Design a protein around this nucleic acid. Sequence first.
RNA 1: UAGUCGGGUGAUUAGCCAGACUCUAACUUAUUGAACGUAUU
Lengths: 210, 105, 530, 103, 110
Amino acid sequence: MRELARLERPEILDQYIAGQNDWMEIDQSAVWPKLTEMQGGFCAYCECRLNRCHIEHFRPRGKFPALTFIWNNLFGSCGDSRKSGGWSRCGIYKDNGAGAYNADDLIKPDEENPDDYLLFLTTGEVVPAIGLTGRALKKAQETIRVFNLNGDIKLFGSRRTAVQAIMPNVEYLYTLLEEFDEDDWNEMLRDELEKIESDEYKTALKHAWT
Amino acid sequence: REFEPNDDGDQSFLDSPDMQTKGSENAQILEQVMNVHSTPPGIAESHWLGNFELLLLDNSGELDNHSQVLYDQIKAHFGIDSIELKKADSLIRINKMKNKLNKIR
Amino acid sequence: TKQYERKAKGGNLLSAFELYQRNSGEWFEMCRDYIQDGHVDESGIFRPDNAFYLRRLTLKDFRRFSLLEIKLEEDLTVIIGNNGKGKTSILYAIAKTLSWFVANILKEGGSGQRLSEMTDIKNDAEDRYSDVSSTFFFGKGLKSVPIRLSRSALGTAERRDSEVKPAKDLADIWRVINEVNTINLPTFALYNVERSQPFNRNIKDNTGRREERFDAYSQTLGGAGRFDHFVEWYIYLHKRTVSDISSSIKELEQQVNDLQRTVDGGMVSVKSLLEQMKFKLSEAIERNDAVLTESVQKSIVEKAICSVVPSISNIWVEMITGSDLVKVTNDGHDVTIDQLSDGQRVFLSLVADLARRMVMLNPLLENPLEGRGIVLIDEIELHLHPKWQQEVILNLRSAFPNIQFIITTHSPIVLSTIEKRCIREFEPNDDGDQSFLDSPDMQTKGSENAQILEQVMNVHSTPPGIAESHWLGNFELLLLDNSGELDNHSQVLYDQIKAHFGIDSIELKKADSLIRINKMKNKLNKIRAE
Amino acid sequence: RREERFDAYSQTLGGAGRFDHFVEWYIYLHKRTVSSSIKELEQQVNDLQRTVVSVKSLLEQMKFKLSEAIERNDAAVSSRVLTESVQKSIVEKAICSVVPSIS
Amino acid sequence: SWFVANILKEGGSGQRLSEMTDIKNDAEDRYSDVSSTFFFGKGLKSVPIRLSRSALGTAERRDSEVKPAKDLADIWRVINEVNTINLPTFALYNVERSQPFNRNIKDNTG
RNA sequence: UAGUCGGGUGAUUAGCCAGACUCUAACUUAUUGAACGUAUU
Ligand SMILES: Nc1ncnc2c1ncn2[C@@H]1O[C@H](COP(=O)(O)OP(=O)(O)O)[C@@H](O)[C@H]1O
Ligand SMILES: [Mg+2]
Ligand SMILES: [Zn+2]
């Protein structure tokens, strides 16, 4: 889960008004170019490469009908509702699979940096970060539970494999901390960290590298 | 043609998997197509490496008494030449080096 | 005799029994205590003081084996190998030996099974006979019970004799002591690949009664169980539970109480039904009021089935259509047994049959499934999805904690749940002259399936007869041949990998990793050269 | 299969009067007759379904009764038939009245 | 089964759906349909077949539509009668294929 | 951990205490005969 940088609000949300208008009315191909600029063709929550994808209301339309055409509330999530059932992470699982949840107790990735809450183990679990109690522990635990960031085997395995592929390199780089001077070695680490923005599960790969 | 795992009989079409299976590793097919963990989740020993890593990260990368005990358990159970022990060794080496860098800074 | 007295007072079971037979009180009690004494451990599980298990098996000129010795675990032994290594042969040999105990528990001087003169002698054996030698253990007072089954080839003039008297002698103790005062009895069962049969509800057995205790030994080593007998027995249990009025009164009292709560909750439509049930309850109470062992037996078996069989949450008998039907809740849906998938039915059949037999043979135990016995299962993974394979051994051992299980498997998933000490593994290039079976070098319990395949089962992670299976290996070799630089040939193959496996494939990520590490290694090499 | 009125003419002129047929039939009728409007029954089934562990046996009985009522409703004028309870009573009376020394 | 029956005999009947086992337990319409479409070269791009079975209570009978199977099978049968042709193989191997071998090899009845 | 060996205690074939061992790996056996130990002479 990455810290996201929301910037500019699209024209089409100004036209439609919450209460009177329905969500199905809007042209969704208008919305995606701004989300794709923000998120980079990757999911908000799990950081898979988007191929089957839908617009996700962070606070849902059922519970919160006032929050409908609001630019804060939209995110590009993995999986498609229309195509098929049995998608079991992220936006679809938030609604159906995770029944009862406090919408307050979830990490909104545009507002908050998730790196304070979530730690990514090289074994490919995601866990509460070292030293959290009370509310920050509760937010870490519920984000993991509701978006199903361990329970989806397709996700868990795909993340575990991605990290384990680079672990020869991470081992090898830090052995050459001895021989190289700082300006060479820091250029090497910055280059790697540059490459993994274009890669999938980038937060998991960062925690391996840094 | 694969059925969805949580099909309650109302699936209209059987579909192809997303991953190419021909020439792929069996462990990948287990997880990505058959929806089964490559390591048995109902065995405690299957979690030891994860737990070991968490302990190492809690103690700024140094083997404390608790991490050493678990290391010895991993060694005793899986063996000196096991892939699991090699992973543990790797974790120690990497985390020690990361911590040394942090101290220099 | 004074000699027998000394041995018996030293704790020898056979001597105590001999003294009992010659003086036909003290000696009887010794024998009965030896069989019945035990304790409940820290985990709340009953443990007999004197365990019964197979210790060792030796096969001489039997089928594929010239001379083979196997040492078995007291709890669980798993035999692995390729097809045709003789895994089934081993279980067959054991089952025939166990048949001698079963025959003699049923009948004094009963005859067990025999080795086949047509099929069981090794084809190229110079001596034209075969031997199956077994040694069993029954506590420290009877450390060795040796049995030998033997058979000479058809048309050989010299005939080789079996030695079965020790089996008979032990089985006699069980039979005779039981006749005087009831004891718990050992369960012996074989489940081979024949357990996969089509189900027929209608074909009913008229060859004995199903509620008689020793029916538990009926066809127990035939290989299929008798799931038909289970269904009959279970319906019988149901009828008896319905018939005794106090449970019916208790059930009716519970139904009246539930209906009264519904009426108090505002549902006035069910008031007519409540009045009818209150009348039925009053009538039942008025009829002559007096826990059924049958009710407890039924509950034990239901719990066992539901605990071991993952898709089954409930099992019950319905009579209301006018015929007796066993129904189950399978994956949240109420279905008949005939509606179950073959995988579910076959596994249900195994557990149901085993539970029935244990309940019948262990009437004095609080949990009858904590009885003693030896159970043989061929191809435990038969018809099971990988998900189920990951639970099957754990569930069986939890439900039947004192049984010795001897199992065969082809499943790495099953092996990932079992300790290496329990595994017995054929050498790959055996050809039936290996003397002793051994455990694998690698620890299997908790290990990755890919590793088990390669290290234990000698199977490559990728299918060797597919070209694409070699591409990443070849790609790595090309990188190493061209001093780590991506040449025309390496680029072509990279593109092929990308095109075939896809952009987010494991294979491509590994290739990318190789490129990155090799580039970094080369940069180091250049810095060192300068 | 279910039974139908004109089964009375099956094997009537050779094959009638076999003890095994009787016993099977009689036990069947007994099991069915051990223990209302369709709409009322539909409402009762719906109420019992909403309540549903101890009432599950009662729900199954009521569902059976509803199905039978619908079937009888759906069944034709030509196949009109007395309740299984009445049938049983008449046959029992006939046997006891006719057969020497069975009361 | 409908192709096989009609290759063997004119107007041969294949197998039917079971009223007891093949109908979905909670089917509102109380019938079951198995619809199949076969291909036989560009000359015969679509051979549709439907097997149907209604539940016991029978508000209306749903009949199977098997005529195209019969028509195609007739072509194979009739042409083969005049001049030997190659014929299609149809086989099912279910889990019942796992069964013991009887050694008692029978009569050459022919 | 388990199994095994056994110096001591113990109205003593039990139990308890102490110390030790670990090739994949004991299962205590049979007389009037033979041999051995003891007794007899
Ligand atoms: N009498 C015999 N002589 C020689 N080889 C035999 C004899 N009987 C069986 N075999 C061989 O033994 C094997 C039987 O395998 P089986 O016992 O079923 O083991 P598995 O179940 O592991 O395949 C086959 O390779 C077969 O050729
Ligand atoms: Mg002597
Ligand atoms: Zn996602």
